[PDB]
Design a protein around this ligand. Structure first.
Ligand SMILES: C[C@@H]1CN(CC(=O)N2CC(C)(C)c3ncc(Cc4ccc(F)cc4)cc32)[C@@H](CN2CCOC[C@H]2C)C[NH2+]1
Ligand SMILES: [Zn+2]
Length: 100
């Protein structure tokens, strides 16, 4: 999309985020997601991928890589190797583990 490109702008959309959803605004906004204003529906500012029905223990970066692996914002922030491993591809696991 053309909006919500900054972390601060994404955070502002969470003003009416329901307090009972077990995933928090900071986690979502960091992973590129902003609140669309209905239920627990979020969208990525970059790939426009939509996610809902957040569950306790969900990791927004893992959900981003599981559903929208070609997102250029996801790749810039987390790197192609992170996305590959979420997609079940491990030819570069040792180097990944070593590098960090
Ligand atoms: C966090 C986790 C996500 N998960 C998948 C999910 O949310 N995806 C996967 C898919 C990309 C196929 C998809 N496409 C449309 C919508 C709808 C939408 C959401 C936001 C929005 F702004 C506008 C529309 C959701 C959605 C949940 C399980 N989902 C729940 C829905 O049915 C599919 C199922 C697999 C569990 N929680
Ligand atoms: Zn995205």
């Amino acid at each position: 999309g053309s909006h919500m490109q900054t972390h601060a702008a994404r955070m502002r959309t969470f003003m009416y985020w329901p307090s009972s959803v077990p995933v928090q605004p900071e986690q979502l906004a960091s992973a590129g997601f902003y609140y669309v204003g209905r239920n627990d529906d979020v969208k990525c500012f970059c790939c426009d991928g939509g996610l809902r029905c957040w569950e306790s223990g969900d990791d927004p970066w893992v959900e981003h890589a599981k559903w929208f692996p070609r997102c250029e914002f996801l790749i810039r922030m987390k790197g192609q190797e992170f996305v590959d491993e979420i997609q079940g591809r491990y030819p570069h696991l040792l180097e990944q583990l070593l590098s960090t």
